[PDB]
Amino acid sequence: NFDPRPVETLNVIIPEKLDSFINKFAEYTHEKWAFDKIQNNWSYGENVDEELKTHPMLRPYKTFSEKDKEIYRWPIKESLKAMIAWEWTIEKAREGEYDPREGYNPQPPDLSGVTLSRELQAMAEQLAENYHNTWGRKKKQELEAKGGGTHPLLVPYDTLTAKEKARDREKAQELLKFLQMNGYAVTRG
């Protein structure tokens, strides 16, 4: 009887002082996506070709227009809005701490060495559940409107295994690790 109710974010205002953080994390997200592709032998080219391993976004984040940068900034703002709607605190407290291929070579920092406390891991789980509920509500509405069938992910988040949760968990964890790496103190208040 899955009724996904993600937290309301539409009227949530992100403080302007977080814009630099949003930009840094968007570039990081791009660099990580680009790194994985370039190491999997993908390269720049006008078209998105699965066979020839080519993608037009395999270029520096600096070369993207502001509207194009929204491919990355938009999901980041949505995450931040959810954290703000829950009255979590996000405050800067510290200083913001392989084969070289042909052309673009992004070297993003490794977030495997960034450790999350029990509290931040619980917070990542709450963000992950919200990603599941956001997608779930959107999917349920799409299927209802477009007369579609069903989907195995249209079930409560707490009925999923650790592996089924991994994608949303890793997205939430990457955000809290980057926040921590950049000197932000994040709490549930």
Side-chain angles (χ1 to χ4, degrees), residues 2-4 6-7 9-16 18-23 25-38 40-45 47-50 54-61 63-94 96 98-100 102-106 108-137 139-166 168-189:
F2 186 50
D3 173 40
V7 69
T9 65
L10 201 53
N11 322 288
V12 177
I13 300 308
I14 296 162
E16 266 185 90
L18 282 179
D19 283 341
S20 199
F21 173 78
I22 294 161
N23 292 0
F25 189 43
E27 182 187 70
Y28 162 79
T29 303
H30 173 69
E31 281 191 24
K32 184 72 181 76
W33 170 78
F35 178 87
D36 296 324
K37 285 270 155 84
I38 286 159
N40 214 100
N41 299 280
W42 284 77
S43 58
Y44 173 75
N47 285 262
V48 176
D49 211 309
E50 203 88 75
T54 197
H55 203 292
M57 278 186 74
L58 288 174
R59 52 187 168 100
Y61 175 88
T63 70
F64 292 154
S65 63
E66 294 304 297
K67 290 192 173 179
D68 279 335
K69 287 173 187 186
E70 289 307 308
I71 284 150
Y72 299 104
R73 291 160 160 169
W74 194 94
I76 298 167
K77 286 183 261 250
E78 284 292 295
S79 284
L80 288 176
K81 279 173 187 183
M83 294 166 77
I84 293 155
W86 293 319
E87 286 155 36
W88 288 6
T89 61
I90 308 158
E91 300 184 332
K92 184 93 167 186
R94 312 164 293 275
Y98 178 84
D99 285 318
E102 175 161 79
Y104 180 48
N105 264 268
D110 182 32
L111 267 66
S112 302
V114 187
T115 303
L116 296 182
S117 63
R118 287 168 176 258
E119 186 58 23
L120 269 68
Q121 283 182 45
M123 285 156 67
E125 184 76 332
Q126 203 173 121
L127 271 165
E129 177 161 35
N130 198 65
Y131 297 151
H132 178 81
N133 289 335
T134 299
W135 181 89
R137 191 176 183 102
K139 176 55 68 171
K140 216 188 169 76
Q141 285 171 328
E142 180 168 67
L143 292 173
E144 274 157 15
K146 294 172 170 78
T150 190
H151 197 292
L153 296 189
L154 293 172
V155 294
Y157 184 80
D158 62 8
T159 71
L160 302 178
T161 66
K163 172 99 178 190
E164 290 152 3
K165 290 176 182 183
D168 291 314
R169 263 171 180 187
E170 287 169 356
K171 186 187 158 176
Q173 281 192 1
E174 183 165 77
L175 166 67
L176 298 175
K177 284 169 176 244
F178 201 76
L179 273 158
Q180 179 174 297
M181 185 198 271
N182 286 270
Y184 285 86
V186 188
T187 79
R188 283 197 282 188

